[PDB]
Design an enzyme around this catalytic site. Sequence first.
Site: not given
Ligand code: HEM
Lengths: 713, 713
Positions: B77, B244
């Site tokens: 972010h 993810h």
């Molecule tokens: C289309 C793009 C993306 C969408 C729509 C998206 C969406 C989200 C959403 C809704 C969450 C959940 C937030 C929560 O409820 O705690 C999240 C978690 C996460 N996203 Fe994405 N994401 C995207 C791209 C990315 C990218 C580019 C990365 C890193 C390279 C990333 C890494 C993560 C990680 C590591 C989590 C987990 C957080 C946790 O374990 O607390 N995401 N994502």
Amino acid sequence: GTSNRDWWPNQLDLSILHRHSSLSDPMGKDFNYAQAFEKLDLAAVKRDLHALMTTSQDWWPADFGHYGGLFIRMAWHSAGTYRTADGRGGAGEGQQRFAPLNSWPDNANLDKARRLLWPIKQKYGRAISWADLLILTGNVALESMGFKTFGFAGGRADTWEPEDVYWGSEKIWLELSGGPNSRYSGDRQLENPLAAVQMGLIYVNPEGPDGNPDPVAAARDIRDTFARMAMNDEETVALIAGGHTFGKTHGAGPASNVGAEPEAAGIEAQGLGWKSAYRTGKGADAITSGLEVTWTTTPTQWSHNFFENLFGYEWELTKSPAGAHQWVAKGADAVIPDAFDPSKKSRPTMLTTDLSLRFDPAYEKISRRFHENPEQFADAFARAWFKLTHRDMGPRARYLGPEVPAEVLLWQDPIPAVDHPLIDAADAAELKAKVLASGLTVSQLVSTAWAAASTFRGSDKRGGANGARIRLAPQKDWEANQPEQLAAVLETLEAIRTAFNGAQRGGKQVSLADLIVLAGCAGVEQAAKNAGHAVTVPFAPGRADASQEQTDVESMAVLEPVADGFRNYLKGKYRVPAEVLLVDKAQLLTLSAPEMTVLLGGLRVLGANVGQSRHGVFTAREQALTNDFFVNLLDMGTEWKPTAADADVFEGRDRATGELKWTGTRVDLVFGSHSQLRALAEVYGSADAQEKFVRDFVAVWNKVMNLDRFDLA
Amino acid sequence: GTSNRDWWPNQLDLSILHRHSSLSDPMGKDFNYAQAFEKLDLAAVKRDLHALMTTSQDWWPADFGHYGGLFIRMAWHSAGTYRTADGRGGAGEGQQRFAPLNSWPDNANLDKARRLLWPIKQKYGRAISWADLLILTGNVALESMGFKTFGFAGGRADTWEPEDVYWGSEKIWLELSGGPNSRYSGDRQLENPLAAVQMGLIYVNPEGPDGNPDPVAAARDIRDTFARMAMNDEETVALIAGGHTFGKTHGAGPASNVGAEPEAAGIEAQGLGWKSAYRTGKGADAITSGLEVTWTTTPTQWSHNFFENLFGYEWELTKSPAGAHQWVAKGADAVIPDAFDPSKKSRPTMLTTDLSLRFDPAYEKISRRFHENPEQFADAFARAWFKLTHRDMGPRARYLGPEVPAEVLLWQDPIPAVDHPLIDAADAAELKAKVLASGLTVSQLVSTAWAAASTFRGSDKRGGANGARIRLAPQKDWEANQPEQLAAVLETLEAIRTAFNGAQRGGKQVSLADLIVLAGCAGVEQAAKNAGHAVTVPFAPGRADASQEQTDVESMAVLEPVADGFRNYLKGKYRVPAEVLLVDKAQLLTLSAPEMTVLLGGLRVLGANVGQSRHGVFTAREQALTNDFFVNLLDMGTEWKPTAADADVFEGRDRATGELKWTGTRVDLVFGSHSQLRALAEVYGSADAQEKFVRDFVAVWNKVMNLDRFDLA
Ligand code: HEM
Ligand code: HEM
Ligand code: NA
Ligand code: NA
């Protein structure tokens, strides 16, 4: 574009503390305006200004062939925004040329006045500020029309952006009272710190209160707003009757003819506004206030005709050509000259507010005295016009040029000249050792010097530790100053002073003003020592002691800190949150956000709080100069909750055990909440920051101690 | 408190150009973050951060016992706000800790993540910025979970206030499209410069476009917003599937339980927000996005199980416990571990947007390749994560520390090393004389060097005269650069270059990048000469020339000036007024209002306008460096009116005779209209100003020439 202000309209605004940076200033960082002005040929400027008076320009033709009236109104509006409550407004920064004041309704067509001065401004350049020039032009107008002024001082440095002032909450220009953002409540009580009856007016409504043409009730509004501008009844009558000895008002047709004010006007209007569709839009056809009054039979010459007319006729209520309430003399001959047609004359006329000077009983006595004794009138108006146009300039040491009046006036909060050798570095070290040997505590020393020094406000440059006015009425009795404790500190410093001075040769002696500040330096040095650090705090002698007779107690009242977050003090309940009041005080002290941060963190651990409160004292080593405040505030092991009893006091408890560690106020906790402030606290609360904290603290301390020291400027 | 923005909401805002003053910075004026960071023990920081990953704090318990996923999300972010259209956003300034980003709904519970870092930030103090720390923490999370990163550079200095960025016009968080302030029009075309689908989102809606759970249509929004962040399809798939691989989302109960975001929270919250009333409000019960998805069987370890799952199962639509749309593999066994209960497992789940990587046809080819060849996936993701997190850092010369990747990447707009002696002061003087003897004119010289240097933007530190990319595609063909004129200048400079370099011994030579700048310096010097003044314009050699092979043409397109007020150029019609676009360009150039003022008034009389337009050329001595622009603009003898043909072109006519003197645009006349800008114009238009104008011009010119010279930092 949506801004932070839109999403969170109640968050604290710090950008007021970073206004007037070197970024917005076109002059180099070492430009010194006083030096520039001292080399100006002020006589040559005055010659040009005299010549301008009767040099009519076709885009704004001069009434009666003479711009004098317009320029007097210009200079009076420049000064006329001043409020004694906070010191803001006034002529000293030349803010008439920026928003919003350039576009206030009561400043209509002063844009033309300011434009007429550009050729002179341009000729003399940096050697005469706009701020000085507006006032000087007012004085030359008087002089040109036969009125001897009391004097003039230069030294008002130009500014380069709008000042952040609270001018009221109304969202409609000129809104009458009792609206959703009313500035009036109760029995016509105007909200502090405001000094005008309507948004966009200088003082009062010339038709009468909320447009009701009752000169008696208008007099109440005059008296209240002039008092909030530092003027008494004598000065008020002298200023209004003196100003309306000259010129005229402008109301030749309906106000609907007048278009956008300068901030709203098109780019092609090139900084001007209020373009009028009524006939020629100017000169004989001009519309400014909508009133059409010419006071005297010789509007371009000093005369005694104002009071002759006021008393000499009975008055009848009539309407100008724009529809505004005004008065006309019953049965008079047409004796008043037209501004443009030699063959026309009209009857004497007055505003509602001019009639106040006859129909209010207290004004009537003064008005009559001035009518019967025109020399007294002339002298009072000369004194009052100088006061008007210098009230916000600060100490006399700031006054420049060859026309400064030598007479010392009460309102200038005068400081006697120093006529003896000052203490040197060895004498300062001796006195500091005496002070620390007396048994005075860190807390005592720091608190006292903070109390003495922090009355300063940069808005009008009043206050500060010079003069030792903390020992006088009314400062010695202010609740924030802890009168009983203060008296015991002053007693002990006075005995130190008397002993030192009685030992000297030559005429060497220390003032109490200097000793109070040097004593506070000793307290900060002792605090550093308590924390294990070797620190020397700078001290500049040369302050003197003012007398009670040199200290107008009623005018000092506005300097009282009723909110001082730096001592965690709030004298009562306010509608404004305490952290907003802190930022306001930081602004008056001329502090940036970093400076405010460091200063408050330090003062808390030094024991400056009023009443020895523990709120914010986040240290186990009180009276030692450390960065404990920050390190403890930011500890996530502590959880904070508002107390049951008072939602503006918080308890900090160990998140694991529930044990009470600290208490704090909103002023304290805001440094852990607000995201910009917290980022500053983090700097000072880091492991590598103790030295930086001490150095930065000493610097801001010394800054505060020297705020009023324009003798060293 | 009614403000100027309330009374005149459409007046130009200059305070963007005086942000980031020395007033608001707590660090001393000589603080150099690069020097601090170079002595940081980076290895020690990374050890502390590794230990942190598995040290759970009870106020925000770690999922799976490991904060790695949370920190990954945090750093993505931080970087994910970036927009290629203007360079604004990105991780390079640590702006996630300020408003509004700290409170965006897509940033929920990242406040907890930042707070878990404070003990480390505190330990190391000024030697590691927040901005570097956020990114470094994401790297260490990756590494701790078995993923080999590509490298890391430090050098992102902290900032102390919010950046002024246009994030959109919506007044409601997360507003669906088609509202009154819709950021979409046409066939789902997102307005430039925005790079997210809804206000407060990083890129796209995880449920699908405006909440429609169609993975095919969601892929169109992914592609468009990633592209606006400079990522292609390969990089996008790598980044989403890579991120993810780890962690989980949080949606344990209804979103109504979640309270105020940080900027709205009470003071006792000490900078945190989104306090939840759902059960414990944290850990197993956490609510963040409202989704409840856990992608892989080993959420704390790098794996290829994201794609194993995505392709290995057939997916069905379901709802989280908060009611959001998401997907579940119904035929699967319960193979996904719970975050807090070792005895619970559940089925694989996916977001709509995850399914886009299989059901969009172009994505599916790439996802399939990465599924079958997880080494290619690991390498694409490491390269993309480095790019994501460094894209706004500027030239490689700014990169600090021991983990900088040695590989030179095309996106970095690389500049070849210089391996030879640099020209000295006598050589520069010889070259200036040769340039001036060639017959190249002041106008040619000035215009060329302005064109070369003024691509720079401080938002992402891309652009500037280093590289001599003005000779290459696409810059040599940009309409603002006057491609036929430019080619003639470059031919003549190139011949001068070849002659000088052919005469040298011992390896000394000059680059064309350096000669373009130095020729511009000659033009400014000659212009001063033409006005009767001898000046020397500073010049620093050391630029090198990049090749066409080292220049990504598609990525350079965003640097094209489509509005450049300094050359009175507007490539088309815009809804935003030209003077707004000027202040925006000044901000990207890092100019204050005075600098913008001086620079524009000089360029007008030097002949820098595109197409030799006469608009704003308010001088009878073109190609002489004089303050004529200001003197003539401010002359009240000239009256200004919009033309019949074009309301944004104005004629200036003698007020008395009606004779046509000048023409101008809004960009020219704003300087005579706006009350702050006109106050600046007055300084430079005064009779004492000729020296100051030339000195200030030369300084700002030299500033613009050196914007990209981080090799001299
Ligand atoms: C289309 C793009 C993306 C969408 C729509 C998206 C969406 C989200 C959403 C809704 C969450 C959940 C937030 C929560 O409820 O705690 C999240 C978690 C996460 N996203 Fe994405 N994401 C995207 C791209 C990315 C990218 C580019 C990365 C890193 C390279 C990333 C890494 C993560 C990680 C590591 C989590 C987990 C957080 C946790 O374990 O607390 N995401 N994502
Ligand atoms: C109760 C306080 C005051 C009221 C309500 C007031 C009201 C006004 C109004 C309505 C005008 C007409 C503006 C126009 O239409 O052009 C005006 C003009 C003027 N006022 Fe006042 N006035 C006040 C005090 C002052 C003071 C303190 C001074 C100066 C010492 C002053 C000097 C002038 C002069 C010289 C003009 C004539 C301007 C011209 O000739 O163009 N007035 N006043
Ligand atoms: Na003031
Ligand atoms: Na950026």
